[PDB]
Amino acid sequence: RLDELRRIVSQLDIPVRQVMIEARIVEANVGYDKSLGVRWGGAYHKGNW
């Protein structure tokens, strides 16, 4: 039993394997906004849009 337990000990005393985990977050924002306000105002003859 001593010897068998020794073998189990050999199996158990194994280095735990570390891994480097690299998770990367990428955010991309593209924004194009165009606004045109066209104005025609005359109070001389009261025509104004």
Add this chain to the structure above:
Amino acid sequence: SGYGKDGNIGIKDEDGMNCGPIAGSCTFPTTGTSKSPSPFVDLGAKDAT
């Protein structure tokens, strides 16, 4: 007066009278006004929409 873009220029004439023109009306047939500055300013702002 309108309703979608309501307009009742009778009160606008009141505002013009506040501006300072001479309005005289002794009967429904007879009326007359002079020195009215209400149309160019009152119409322009009121009708800006």
